[PDB]
Structure formats: structure tokens, C-alpha cells
Amino acid sequence: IKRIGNHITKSPEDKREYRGLELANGIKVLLISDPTTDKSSAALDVHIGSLSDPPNIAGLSHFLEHMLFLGTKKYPKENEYSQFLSEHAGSSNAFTSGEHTNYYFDVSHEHLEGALDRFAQFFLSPLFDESAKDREVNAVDSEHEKNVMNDAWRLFQLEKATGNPKHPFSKFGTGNKYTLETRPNQEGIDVRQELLKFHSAYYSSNLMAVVVLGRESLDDLTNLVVKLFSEVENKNVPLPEFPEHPFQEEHLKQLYKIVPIKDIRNLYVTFPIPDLQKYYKSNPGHYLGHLIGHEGPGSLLSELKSKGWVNTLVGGQKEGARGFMFFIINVDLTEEGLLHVEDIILHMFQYIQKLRAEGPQEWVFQELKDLNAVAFRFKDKERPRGYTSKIAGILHYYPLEEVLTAEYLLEEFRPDLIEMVLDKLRPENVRVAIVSKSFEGKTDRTEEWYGTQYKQEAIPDEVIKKWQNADLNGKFKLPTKNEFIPTNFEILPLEKEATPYPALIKDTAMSKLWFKQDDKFFLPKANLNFEFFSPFAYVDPLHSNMAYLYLELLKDSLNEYAYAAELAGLSYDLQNTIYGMYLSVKGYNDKQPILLKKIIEKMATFEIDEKRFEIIKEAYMRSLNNFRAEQPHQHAMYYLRLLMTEVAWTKDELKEALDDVTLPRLKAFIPQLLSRLHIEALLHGNITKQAALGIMQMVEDTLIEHAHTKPLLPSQLVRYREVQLPDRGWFVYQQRNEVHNNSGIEIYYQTDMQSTSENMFLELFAQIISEPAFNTLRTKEQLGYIVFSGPRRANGIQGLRFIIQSEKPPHYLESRVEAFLITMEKSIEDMTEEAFQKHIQALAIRRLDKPKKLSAESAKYWGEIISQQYNFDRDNTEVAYLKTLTKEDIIKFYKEMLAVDAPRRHKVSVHVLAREMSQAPALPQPEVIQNMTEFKRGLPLFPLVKPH
């Protein structure tokens, strides 16, 4: 009741009333009211990172958030928070950064109290026990154990490592069961007392901020949050910070050489800079990021493309902890790009000096500020979970008025700070890091935490005083005036024939359309998507392999053009699919024709630059064979899909048939793919119907004019089918993951086709076991960190599956899955009526749920139009059937389909095992699959779903 805000800045598009305030204990509290919300939510953000761990025990903050979910004193039950949040269509999640820790959930329509009080008790008083600390370090072990081979983490921790080892930046965030449990009891240090001291010392102070997205009012719930978080008492803890940047000059001007596990090649150029979060109005780091990492005519990337060294580069500044900041230029390399690294970084300082001779620019600032203002003014709607965590995550830095207008509105252009940050980029401030797999036997030093190998080649002063000596220019230039900036912001009015669902308007043997004027959102922007078909796209590996090469070289030769469209707010995307290729252009309403047209005319009338083809061929050949270095459960989900379809070729087939694709072969292939084809598309958003027909008209007329496209026969508009397992079966086949020391498994129960009365059986049964599966297979039995069980839907045919990876041998896992099945049905027949209607209500709220963003319903319409079902109302009638279901019905679904004695039992299993590898029921004999194609030769195939 200390501070109340009067009115804050909101976009005139929003409707959500806001209020900011501050409590007696100094918590910055933000209140959001919404009359038309449907899932309320809340979050909190304690400003304590993993950079405040004690030196003996490493990774307490992460172990603490990981242990806080389990157990309080006002709710001694182990799962009452998770169980109550999952009975009400909600989900809770949390994480720790290096500087702070976010806690956030969401909940159903009005159940704020019964879940907010559970989230509040979270911090008033937690109670731990032997059990939790005893079976949680196994989950933190799986956490580290999935990232010891994870290539996004080894460089992160190796940059954390080779710095100032007396500095708090050189700290470990995770803990690997050895420093957490085994080291402190190696020397008798207790852990529970350390956890209660950590929590009572750090977390309880002013530091944390809260936010709640309420339904009721902006005065009904302000008096709610003043009586519910008032207990946490300010201990006057100042924010931990440290003015000394971790890079001291002894370890500057140095060039490491790191050896990866998966085959990649990269060059990181690291500069240290002081803190510029205090300067959040001029934002000099975004200026130099806009001027360095910019594709287009005559810029840093396009020249490195032109010399054949570099595929892409990312500029901008990395932000680390508080009181210090970084600045990174990270590049990847071609085969002979790794020979000329000194010349690459020489060109980088060439472009820097070309930007230092001319310095600041007024019109670039005005352009960027106009772009952020227009991008703020039509800011789309937010999903209420994740949004409140974001605006609680930046609430520590900014005052109450501009909590929303953060990095969107800019007041002044001050060239002095541009010049300041542009002076700190000097080759006395460099730290080069090279990643290449060619250094296998050359590395002396190794990492202790993760076990990676690297070097010290400190750069002698030859090449430093070759870098800053004489830097005039290459063929660089500044970017030119933008023409994709939008000018039309007019909402077109609703016409006479206004429909709630997209209607078929054109139906010819060449194309079809699906059109709907936007009725809800009124944003001057629309999304257009297309799916071109060809029977030649997946005939054999060679023709399934040329498709990715052609499409990729199209994206290569057109990014140079269309980066200004992706920068102004018009994004396109063109990738291949199994049946044919695909296209999706979304964004502001004004410049779709220009962009789409240019995409088509670059698509049909397409030449090949030979060196570009020869680069992309190798960059894909090195992207097939490094599929073997990847997670076990992803290999399970890869193998299961290949076996359960009519035709598909492995990653071992396609990389053998890349020894044949050549330029003349590919060059006659493009007229073969675009010779006869068929188009299917939806148009969505704010467009009139005559302009919709004009869009498809220009599209198919350009393909007529340049490609001589003819329509396909309707008997070769076909899909693929799914293998039908025998009425009683136990299919399993094992493969061996080569580089991960874990095992993994996926088991598949296939029921039937897409019906309106049989999707709700499997959906409800996958909702009744969603929490107990997590609760008894990850928490209680501690089988690993990756546990998931839900509906899998391919080709219409629905099946319930289980993805799980662990240290244990996999048939042990499949047996204890069966134990979970038995315990589940025993818990189903015992459960009461009221909880059963609660589960039905949780599914009727989760599924009967309106999409907020316009792309969230265009991806709801398109995802079924590409499945040829065309059923737009399956969210209403299906859930109207869900309300009339009985308790015995689920047992009738269960007994003959999922049970062990069932007559109708379809089950196939994929075992991925490792490099060197409570009552269980009785399993029948398996039959092993030693060959996929001889397997798929003797089984029938399901029929396809008839359209609506």
C-alpha cells in the first residue's frame, strides 16, 4: 500500500485494463484485468540466480526450485499443487537463470484462489524431507546427463570455464549428483541445512516481483494480492552485483580450438563491453547490431557469401549477469572457410572501420524507431501464460509506467554512446574461438565439468597489427532505403456473405481456395499459405533428395532480396514436404503481392550458381550423417514413424544416393517437378474476396506462363497409408544409439481411425493418466527426466504412446509401463463421480478454447485442410459429445484395446539402447522385426478418412 500507479502506457489496440502498485514489503506488483479471458494465470520472479551458490555445494538454486514444488506445511501432500493445477486445465513450470528465477503457472476460468493460495504457500514456508532430497538428485543427474553430449551446452560452460576461475561467472549451474550429493557427504557437509539457510537468506526479501492476469476487476483482486503475499517479509537484501568484468587482460587476445562431437564448424568473435542496460532509451547495442548483422546488397554477410567462405552470420550483443555485457559476431564455416580465418576476421574489422569512418546515421535511427513504433501499435494478443512471466521478468529494471513499452519506444538518438560502444570494438579486445572437429589428437587441455577438449593458441602480434593497420574498405556499403515499410493500415469492412468458417470459393482441376475475412482481430495483416503437389517428389531417394537441394538453393538465392521483408514484418517460409513443396507468407497487409509474386518468378525461372550448389551439397551431406549424434528418444520417434507408414526411406538411404546428384541431373529435375502439379491453399485475414481470387490468379498464371504447368489427373492425387498391426501382437525392434550413454524407448498402442465418438475415448484416457504418469514414473520411481504419454495421430489413425529415456535397460521400462497400466485401471474403477466430472470439465475447457493470435487459428484451419478432412467444427460437436460419457465407457474402451488380455491389442515398440549396453505382470512372447520392408510386406493397410 506504499505506491499506486495512476495510468500507464498501453497500445490503443489492447483492451486489458492495467494497474501497477507496490506493497508494504517492497514488491513491485502488476495487475491485469480482462473481462473476456478464459484461463487466468500468474507468475513471480525472484531476483536470485545461480551466481549466488556457495563454493562448496554447486547448483543450489536449481536444486531449490526443483525441490520447492514438492511439499509445504499447509499442504503436506506431495503433489497437491500439481494435482490441483492439472485437475483444472492448467500447467505449472519454472526455471532458473544465472541471475534470477521464474515461477509461473496458469489455471482455469475462475479457479484463482484454490491455485493462487497453493502458489503463495510456495514461499511462506516450505518443508523438505529425506525422501525428496533423496530422489530428486537423480532427476538433476538426468538433467546434466542429457547435456553432457548436448552441443548447445558444451560451449556455454566452456566459455564459463576459461575466464577468471576465481570469479562468480566461473560457476556451474546444474550439479551432476556428484558435487550435489556425493561431495558433501564425502566430507560430511549436510545439505538440508544449506537449503533452509539459502532460502531464508536470499529468497524472502523485496527482490521478488509478482504478476497476476485476473478476470474479475482491477479492484476485486488488488485487495486479493495485498492479503496473500503480505507475509513474505523484507530482509533488506541488496541486489548482488559486481563491477569487475570477468575478462582480465591476461586472457585477452586469445584463440581457442575446441573439438565438438557432432560435425560443425564455427568461429566466435567475443568482445567485452560495459553495462548498457542503464541506457534503455538510445540503445547503442541495437544500433550496432542492426548495422553489423544485416543481409542485403553490399553488406558484411553478402561479401563473405561472394568469396564462398560463410553460409550465414549473427551479430548483436550478448547480455551476461549484471554490471557487465558481451558483444558477439558468430559465424559458421565452409570447407575452405576454415583455412582463411584470419582473413575473415580481417574483413570483420574492415566493415567495422567502414562504419567508424562515417559513424552515426540519423535516418537509420528514425527508420528503426518508426519500425518499432508500428510494430508496437499493432502488437498482437498474448497467451496469458508466458506473458505474465515475461512482464514479471523485466519488472525489476524499469519503472511502473513503461513496464509494457520496453524496447519498443525510443526517445532520443545520442551519437555519443554509439561512438562509445563503437570504440570498444578494437583488436586489443578480441577473444577468438574456433570450433572444428579436425583437432582430435591435438588438444592438451580438457574440461573437468563437461569433458571437452580445447587449446591455447594465443594470437601473436603479427596478426593483431595486421588487423588494425590499414583498413579502407572491401566492396561494402551501407544498406539502402527500405521499401517494405508499410503505409496501408486500413481495416477493410465486412461484406454481405460473412461466414464463420473458411469457404471453398474456387474449385478447378488446377487449384482450390479457402477464404475468410477476419472477424475478431481487426489487425491490418493477413496470412496466405500454399501447398504445391507433385507425384515426383518422393518417388525414390534421389528424387526425395533433389527436392531439399533445389528448395534450399532457392532460399539461398532469395534471402538477399527478402531480408528487408522479414525485417519490416513480412515473413515467408518455403520448405519441402513429403507429398510436394510448401509455402507460407504472413505479415502486414500491404506488401504481400510484390513478395509472393517475386517468390514465384524466382521459383519457376531458376538457374543454379555452381559453387553455391557445391557448398549446399556438402552442407547437407554433413547434415545427414550427424543424425547419429542425437538423443535416444528422438531416434525412437524417428524409427516408429518410418515403420508405421506405407513408404519412407531411412537417413541411411538418402546419404548413399547423394553420391549421384550432379548439376546437370538436378537441372533437368526442376522442369520435371514443375511440369504437372496441383495447388491447394487458404487465404486468411483482412482481404477482400476479389483480391483473394486475384492472388490465386496471379499465382497460377505465373506458373502457367513460366513453367508450362498442366493439371494432374485426379487419380494421382494420393496420400500415404498406415500399416495395420494384427489383432493380437507384440512388435519390438532394437537399435543402438552410438554417442549417448542413455537408453530410450517408445511403445505404441494403436486403436483405430478418426471418428467423432472414438477420438474422445482416447483423448479422455490420455487426460486421466497425464498427471499420475508423471507422478509415479518420474517422481516416485525416478525413471529419468524425459517422460511423456499422450495421443499420437498420424494419417487419422489414433494411438496412445509412451516416450521415456533412462539409464535402465529398456525392457525393464516396458514392464513398469505395464505396471502403470494395471495400477491406472485399478485407480479408475475406485475413483468417485465428482473427480470424473472434473476430468471431463478439464478436457472440455482445454479443447473448447479460442485462439488468440491470428496465426493460431490459421494453423488450426490449415492443419486439417492438409489432412483432407475439412472438418472445422470438430471443436464444438466433438466436445458436445464429450459431456455425455459414462464411467463404464472408459472401461469398455480400456478392456479390449489397452489391457494385457485384450482381444484387440495392437502394440509396437522401438528400443534405442546405449553405447555399451510396484508389481510387474506377465508378458507374452515378442516377435522381433529384423527388416522393415519385409515387415511391411505382410500386413494390411488402413483406409483413408473420407472427407466431410
Binding site: 548483422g293 550465414t312 551479430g315 548483436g316 550478448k318
Partner: peptide
């Protein structure tokens, strides 16, 4: 390609 984006 700015790092933030």
C-alpha cells in the same frame, strides 16, 4: 540477423 532477434 541481430542476436536479440
Amino acid at each position: 540477423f541481430v542476436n536479440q532477434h
